[PDB]
Design a protein around this ligand. Structure first.
Ligand SMILES: Nc1ncnc2c1ncn2[C@@H]1O[C@H](COP(=O)(O)OP(=O)(O)O)[C@@H](O)[C@H]1O
Ligand SMILES: Nc1ncnc2c1ncn2[C@@H]1O[C@H](COP(=O)(O)OP(=O)(O)O)[C@@H](O)[C@H]1O
Lengths: 705, 181
């Protein structure tokens, strides 16, 4: 009774009822190719989920369906296999065997050409193996019973290593996440299914932005479904608003009720017969306007909706007319194709065109309909992504280039001085951007200078700037990168030893944050063995863990920080780094890192000493930022440090060893302490006044309370 | 898929040369099996050349029929389907010979397939007979049985025929080319 679980996908394809397959034509051919092999003919689709593996299998079916497959496979019937067949359909330890043997018998003995498939090949075997199909199939594997499997490459590798024997039967086919442009084409191919499902028009630019967004917004989900997820969700958003619309409709009915109350109050009161408030007639104009407007808002919006419903159904009609016309062509019924395919042409073109004309236009805009009822690229999808990811405007405004154009400017606002560091970074970043750099390796930098210099701050600010999120940064505790390196580190414990869920700190965090910066805290303290590990992974971003699991990085900016040249910067020969001083640094770097390492760094950057000139600005800046990030609209500060607190901060706070590190702490301590005190006075309600009253910091600033 | 002999020569060379860890007796076959499949796929609808032209034919056939029955089917806008039909037919006239050459040769190919298998079966059984000194059984499997299969093979190979350009003068090679494919 395999027929109770197995799904004859070939038949479903004969009936359509499947999404079209876009962009995998070669994978399909490859699959077919493998199936066509006389010996090695059991392919697997190996790679990530959400990228059309099913579609490929179905694509094969579709070619079988349309006689676009060599005879050997042309007559084949493709069946989805499932856990349910052996588990749900068994519920006893050995009934898994019986259910599978059922399949093997029924299939081996009938209909000549049958292909089975498992979209979860790892599922077979399972933990403990238990001959969960996995041996029985080899037992009869010479007896045709062609089958295609599939899994995440990382697991595939593990499966090969775990089982071995199926390797002699199965042909992995590498599949991969499609490009953005391919994705858009896919989205376009699937667009009508959403159009129809939701009854929402989709802008072509919207599809484009969905893909663009998936690449920075849903960075760990696979692009094609992810973009589709954005589409589906976005469409749902629109549809929900569309079929409800209470914000305008209910608010305005409530506004009518309120103006009616005002009018009656004005009509019968002491001032009703006076000059005072003789503007009552205008309230009546509002009431009358609403009395006439409100039902038309409900009806007009529904008229817009109806235009979109009819439009949707016209588009649906086309999909259906073609699904049947094309099936007629498939079945060689050229008479129906001549009639039906034909009718579809002016039917849908004239119907849809005029239904689009119902949406119409106004003198000031295309689309007279005010409820939009479509997916608007950024207004809908990017907005949706923002609803899924945060910081709407900066995310909405992303354009690559505007950031790159003003990047150093903006960064110099965040980071004071060391503009050359900023420019250096910006430049390398610009090369990473626009694809000028070789894509195998992201820009990467070695930040040299003292604690409190901003090396890390900047790197975070850059992440801030580039990803609109400073906390994208992944930190690496380099001094802990000992000769024992593996377990809590990117490599992770080698598979086969206890730990599979390894290196989450870096492998997974990076998986979740590809669009980030990886930063090495005092990289010179890393053990040399580890340095070679990161080196191979420094460039050649295609990182693979000790579990054999590929991480795959490219984009991630990599920044190393170092105090190695601290002695040279400690010369304090002005702020700006001087000749010789910098060379001593280079020397030390060359001693510590093999040039091979260094050669992979896009740039080695030496930060200047911030000195007093920078902190004159930094303390002002940080103080303001502290307020701004600290609170929103219940605390409103003057933050006027006056020259005296600025000087105190510079004099006692700023350190030539610890840089701004103590400035931050100091500012926070003293301001927060004064703030808390006056808050406790509770004679304190809103706005602000600040001031200064005259060992280290004996003045203690002292603001009014 | 018939394959030019030099292919095999090159396959083994290529396998050793480029399929690092795979062993020759099997990896060479992997190139064969894969490339055979390559061709088997490439040929799609019977031999190569034909497939592509059939795809043109079918796209044309549909266009013509859609054009045939339309609001403006009688306008030269759509009536151009008659010229499209000349193309459909012209393709059909090339496609048929490609199909027929492939198919009749295929038939011969299958007859060769079976004949050779049958030849081996007769000899296997005849050997069983001779090792037992059973000349009667060996004779039953050698007199007529064997002359029949051998002559079928010779006739079939001649009908298939071969050219310097290809191991199959008609179409069942799908133009597979040693090193190129
Ligand atoms: N071009 C495409 N055509 C149809 N589906 C696609 C395409 N590209 C990606 N997909 C998606 O891949 C999914 C099915 O394949 P896949 O995700 O790899 O299988 P699985 O369901 O195991 O994840 C579908 O949800 C489908 O939307
Ligand atoms: N605007 C700024 N310009 C330069 N440095 C800054 C600025 N603001 C803060 N910093 C300091 O840089 C430090 C973080 O970077 P870094 O000096 O490398 O720190 P750490 O040595 O702890 O890793 C913080 O202590 C921070 O106060």
């Amino acid at each position: 009774y395999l027929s109770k679980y197995a799904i004859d996908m070939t038949e479903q394809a004969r009936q359509g009822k499947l999404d079209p397959v876009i962009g995998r034509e070669e994978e399909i051919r490859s699959t077919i190719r493998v199936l066509a092999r006389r010996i090695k003919s059991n392919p697997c689709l190996i790679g990530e989920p959400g990228i059309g593996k099913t579609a490929i299998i179905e694509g094969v079916a579709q070619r079988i369906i349309d006689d676009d497959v060599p005879t050997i496979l042309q007559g084949a019937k493709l069946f989805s296999l499932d856990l349910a067949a052996l588990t749900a359909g068994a519920k006893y330890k050995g009934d898994f065997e019986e259910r599978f043997k059922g399949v093997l018998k029924e299939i081996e003995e009938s209909k000549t050409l049958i292909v089975l498939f498992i979209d979860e090949i790892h599922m077979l075997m399972g933990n403990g193996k238990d001959d969960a199909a996995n041996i029985l199939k080899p037992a009869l594997s010479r007896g045709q019973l062609k089958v295609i499997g599939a899994t995440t490459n990382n697991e595939y590798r593990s499966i090969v290593e775990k089982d071995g024997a199926f390797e002699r039967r199965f042909q992995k086919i590498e599949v991969a996440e499609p490009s953005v442009r391919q994705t858009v084409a896919i989205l376009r191919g699937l667009q009508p299914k959403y159009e129809i499902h939701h009854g929402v028009r989709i802008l072509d630019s919207a599809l484009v932005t969905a893909a663009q967004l998936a690449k920075r917004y849903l960075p760990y989900r696979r692009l094609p479904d992810s973009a589709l997820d954005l589409v589906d969700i976005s469409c749902a958003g629109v549809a929900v608003a569309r079929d409800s619309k209470p914000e305008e409709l209910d608010s305005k009915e409530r506004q009518l009720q309120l103006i009616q109350v005002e009018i009656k109050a004005l009509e019968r009161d002491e001032d009703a017969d006076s000059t005072t408030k003789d503007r009552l007639k205008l309230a009546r104009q509002k009431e009358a306007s609403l009395q006439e407007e409100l039902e038309p808002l409900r009806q007009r919006y529904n008229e817009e909706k109806h235009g979109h419903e009819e439009l949707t159904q016209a588009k649906k009609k086309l999909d259906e007319l073609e699904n049947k016309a094309l099936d007629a062509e498939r079945r060689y019924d050229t008479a129906t194709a001549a009639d039906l395919r034909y009718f579809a042409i002016p039917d849908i073109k004239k119907q849809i065109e005029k239904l689009e004309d119902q949406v119409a236009e106004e003198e000031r805009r295309a689309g007279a309909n005010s409820m939009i009822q479509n997916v608007v690229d950024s207004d809908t999808i990017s907005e949706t992504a923002a609803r899924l990811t945060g910081i709407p405007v900066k995310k909405l405004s992303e354009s690559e280039n505007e950031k790159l154009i003003h990047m150093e400017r903006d960064l110099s606002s965040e980071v004071v001085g060391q503009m050359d560091a900023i420019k250096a970074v910006s430049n390398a970043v610009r090369l990473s951007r626009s694809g000028l750099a070789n894509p195998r390796q992201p820009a990467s930098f070695l930040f040299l200078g003292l604690s409190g210099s901003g090396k890390t701050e900047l790197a975070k600010k850059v992440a801030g700037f580039l990803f609109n999120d400073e906390d994208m940064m992944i930190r690496v505790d380099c001094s802990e990168l000992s000769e024992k390196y593996a377990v809590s580190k990117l490599l992770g414990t080698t598979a086969g030893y206890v730990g599979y869920d390894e290196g989450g700190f870096l492998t997974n965090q990076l998986q979740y944050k590809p669009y980030s910066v990886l930063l090495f805290d005092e990289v010179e303290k890393a053990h040399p063995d580890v340095l070679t590990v990161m080196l191979q992974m420094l460039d050649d971003g295609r990182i693979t863990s000790g579990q054999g699991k590929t991480i795959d990085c490219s984009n991630c900016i990599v920044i190393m920080t170092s105090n190695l040249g601290a002695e040279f910067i400690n010369s304090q020969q002005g702020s700006k780094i001087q000749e010789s001083t910098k060379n001593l640094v280079m020397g030390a770097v060359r001693q510590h890192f093999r040039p091979e390492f260094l050669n992979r760094i896009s740039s080695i950057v030496i930060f200047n000493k911030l000195s007093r000139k920078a902190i004159h600005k930094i303390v002002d800046i940080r103080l303001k930022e502290i307020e701004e990030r600290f609170e929103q609209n219940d605390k409103h500060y003057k933050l006027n440090l006056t020259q005296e607190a600025k000087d105190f901060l510079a004099k006692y706070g700023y350190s030539d060893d610890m840089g701004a590190r103590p400035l931050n702490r100091l500012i926070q301590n003293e301001i927060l302490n004064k703030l808390a005190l006056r808050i406790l006075k509770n004679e304190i309600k809103d706005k602000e006044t600040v001031n200064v009253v005259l060992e280290a910091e004996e003045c203690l600033e002292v603001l009014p309370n």
